[PDB]
Design a protein around this ligand. Sequence first.
Ligand SMILES: COc1cc(CCNC(=O)c2[nH]c(-c3ccc(C(F)(F)F)cc3)nc(=O)c2O)ccn1
Ligand SMILES: [Mn+2]
Ligand SMILES: [Mn+2]
Length: 180
Amino acid sequence: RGSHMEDFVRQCFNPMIVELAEKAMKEYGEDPKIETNKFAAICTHLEVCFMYSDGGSKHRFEIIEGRDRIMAWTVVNSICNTTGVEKPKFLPDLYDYKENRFIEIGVTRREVHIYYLEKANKIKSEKTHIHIFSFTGEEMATKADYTLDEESRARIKTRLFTIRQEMASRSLWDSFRQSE
Ligand SMILES: COc1cc(CCNC(=O)c2[nH]c(-c3ccc(C(F)(F)F)cc3)nc(=O)c2O)ccn1
Ligand SMILES: [Mn+2]
Ligand SMILES: [Mn+2]
């Protein structure tokens, strides 16, 4: 199954980001060859998480996304057990040592409010931080604390819009938006 979407996502994203997305989808029983929109979304979320951890100081974050399930949970346990913070029900994306909390990164093709409320209804023990970026260039964070510098968030927003543009130039953006 040779799709324009798959070749585009391989030309658009870092080879390592691509490999991590592939491993994560296959672990979840999904096929990147034939479920290509989801492959692109997973790559995008990955790159945003990495970009985000690159903001701030150097020892600041611990990266949870992009690991295998078992080691990601091992790090989450080490975090909770050394810092005393409650253990979250679901695997988050990062941990901020500077503010001592987990961070849940979201990336949506819809309005950021709906995505935020969705991600908030499934974490009832609401001690973790939610930060949502949209494809159109806005964002929303818990208690209005956007964690990072303005320049770092701006780099992320520019990147998401460049992805969206380049997708739309190949007429793949419509199928991507109308797929979430
Ligand atoms: C959810 O199923 C999955 C899950 C995995 C590994 C664990 N996942 C996350 O931790 C995660 N996953 C997503 C996500 C997943 C799929 C889509 C899709 F495909 F619908 F566009 C969009 C967002 N967003 C996040 O913010 C986030 O933290 C691997 C594969 N599939
Ligand atoms: Mn995650
Ligand atoms: Mn996330």
